[PDB]
């Protein structure tokens, strides 16, 4: 690995610089190098790993959606034939997106999840696993689509089960997990009622627990609660 010669602490430091410079591909490469040192990640380090890959794959997803739409229009009734180029380039971006998702899933499987014993780390990594399988599901069209969807669902479900036992309903990781699982239900699993019920219930149980929080924790939790509410407003 091209980061094998760099100190773990230097990789972390450079990931933070890359974030400041909005160099998310560099940031992801630095954090991959840090993971591959083999030590567990602290809370801050888990969040740097996630920021980096969410931004990389997020940009790929946006590009893929632009291209897939152009491709869809090209296949409408009165559309002039323009050759293979739109499909080819959509496939290029798709393959690059799948490759990044596979890279993240590979770090989780070797060996982040198996060493994660505390609820905060284990839920975080299972949520990551659900998210990157969800991104694979967004572009899947073949014979493994069902298995990709079930891999996302299974990861999210295991994370939900742990989070409900071990975290308060206002914990930001738990809230973000519920938010993303609700998006999975709505956008991937063709289950809008499940998405709505999960969001509603998550929001209401968090509301009832806000009284226990400091001002700073209240701000963190209510920010994610607002996203649940925004989706409920869109979906109902």
């Amino acid at each position: 690995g091209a980061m094998g010669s760099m100190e773990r602490a230097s990789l972390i430091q450079k990931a933070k610089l890359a974030e400041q410079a909005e160099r998310y591909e560099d940031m992801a490469a630095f954090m991959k190098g840090a993971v591959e040192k083999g030590e567990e990640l602290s809370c801050e380090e888990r969040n740097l790993l996630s920021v980096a890959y969410k931004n990389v794959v997020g940009g790929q997803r946006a590009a893929w959606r632009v291209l897939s739409s152009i491709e869809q229009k090209s296949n409408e009734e009165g559309s002039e034939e323009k050759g293979p180029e739109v499909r080819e380039y959509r496939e290029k971006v798709e393959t690059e997106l799948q490759g990044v998702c596979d890279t993240v899933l590979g770090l989780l499987d070797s060996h982040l999840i198996k060493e994660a014993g505390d609820a905060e780390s284990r839920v975080f990594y299972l949520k990551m696993k659900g998210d990157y399988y969800r991104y694979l599901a967004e572009v899947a069209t073949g014979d493994d689509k069902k298995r990709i969807i079930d891999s996302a669902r299974s990861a999210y479900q295991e994370a939900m089960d742990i989070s409900k036992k071990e975290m308060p309903p206002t914990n930001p990781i738990r809230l973000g997990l519920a938010l993303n699982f609700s998006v999975f239900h709505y956008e991937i699993a063709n289950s809008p009622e499940e998405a709505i019920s999960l969001a509603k219930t998550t929001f209401d149980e968090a509301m009832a627990d806000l009284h226990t929080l400091s001002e700073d924790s209240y701000k963190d939790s209510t920010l994610i609660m607002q996203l649940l509410r925004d989706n409920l407003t869109l979906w109902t």
């Binding site: 969040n47 996630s50 920021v51 969410k54 931004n55 997020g58 998210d131 930001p172 973000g176 997990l177 938010l179 993303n180 998006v183 963190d220 920010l223 994610i224 996203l227 925004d230 989706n231 869109l234």
Partner: peptide, 7 residues
């Protein structure tokens, strides 16, 4: 619509 990419 999904979790913020940064805390």
């Amino acid at each position: 619509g999904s979790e913020p990419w940064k805390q």
